[PDB]
Each structure stands twice: as C-alpha cells, then as structure tokens.
C-alpha cells in the first residue's frame, strides 16, 4: 500500500498513524507514494 526506499522515510507517517492527521496525506508527504494495489512505480520497488 506504501512503497518507500526505507522505513525511516515512513517516519513522517508516524503523524498519520497517530491521533493527529496534520498532513493527512502523509503517504505523499513521507516520500512514499499512493499505489493502486501492491503496484509500486518501480522508483522504490518495495
């Protein structure tokens, strides 16, 4: 659901998983991107 180069890059998503939702679309504001269905763009291939 979320392809990233590293897990550390998903550190920004810690604000999404938490009761805050400041950015809301952390998936995008976390380096990662929004995939359709387990279909990475290949940029990260993770």
Sign of CA dihedral 45, 7, 1, 21: negative
What residue spans define the domains of the chain?
A: 1-46
Span between the terminal Cα atoms of the chain, in Å: 10
**Is 27 exposed, middle or buried (CB count within 10 Å of its CB: 0-12, 13-18, 19+)?**
buried
**What one-character-per-residue DSSP string does 2-40 give?**
---S-SGGGGGGGGTSSTT-SSS-TTTTTS----SSS--
Structure determined via: NMR
Distances (CA, A) of 30 to 3, 42, 43, 45: 10, 17, 14, 16
Distances (CA, A) of 3 to 17, 20, 23, 26, 44: 16, 22, 18, 13, 6
Please give the CATH architecture assigned to the domain spanning 1-46: 2-Layer Sandwich (3.30)
Supply the DSSP symbol for 42. S
Within 13 Å and on the Cβ side, how many CA atoms surround 35?
Answer: 16
């Amino acid at each position: 659901t979320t392809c990233c180069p590293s897990i550390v890059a998903r550190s920004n998503f810690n604000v999404c998983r938490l009761p805050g939702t400041s950015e809301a679309i952390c998936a995008t504001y976390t380096g990662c991107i929004i995939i359709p269905g387990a279909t990475c763009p290949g940029d990260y291939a993770n």
